[PDB]
Amino acid sequence: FHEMREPRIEKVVVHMGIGHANAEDILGEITGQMPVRTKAKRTVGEFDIREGDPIGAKVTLRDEMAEEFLQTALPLAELATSQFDDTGNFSFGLDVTVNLVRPGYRVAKRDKASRSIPTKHRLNPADAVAFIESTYDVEV
RNA sequence: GUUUGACUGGGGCGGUACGCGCUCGAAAAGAUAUCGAGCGCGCCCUAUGGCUAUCUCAGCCGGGGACCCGGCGAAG
Ligand SMILES: [Mg+2]
Ligand SMILES: [Mg+2]
Ligand SMILES: [Mg+2]
Ligand SMILES: [Mg+2]
Ligand code: NA
After folding, report:
1. Is it true that domain A1-140 has CATH number 3.40.50.1100?
2. CA A18 → C1' B76, Å?
3. Is A124's CB less than 7 Å from nucleic acid strand B?
4. Is A117 in contact with A57 (CB distance < 8 Å)?
């Protein structure tokens, strides 16, 4: 049963929602791989009327690139609880989000016969705290 | 020397139902009138055309009315 039910980290998104950049550089070094532009939608008063327009960058890290990052990110954060997803996710911080899920996630991310992950097989906030807390730190 | 139009609950004034498109009137095929009700067209676009690749939207919810992550979401 287990082994295929135990959580794992799937991508960590580090993004700097600026409002118009030079910031990429630090993201590249803090993570280790090229950042991606963040275009914006809708015209608005913060002199942000431009639809297609660089207004920040993000970096999706997977596997080791994600751990080797969290092995310094987490320590720089304290928070826990309430600040957790209903799906077992959590964002802290410049933002750093951690998407958590169990072994059969590809089923909902592939092209052929894809399918939505059953609520039961979903990751709960609690089942999440456990996994992570059980990895160099403490909850609340 | 001539012209100075037509429509119209007489004619004139007003209007254009004088060329076109849609809903309703229209009576569950088609056709169907009034100066019937609601309201539009006389363009604009070198992309706002064409194809291919990749992709899924409104709105709401939860985590850090811009941006980022997840979730619900046949279509508003
Ligand atoms: Mg004569
Ligand atoms: Mg005369
Ligand atoms: Mg007459
Ligand atoms: Mg008929
Ligand atoms: Na005439």
Report:
1. no
2. 32
3. no
4. no
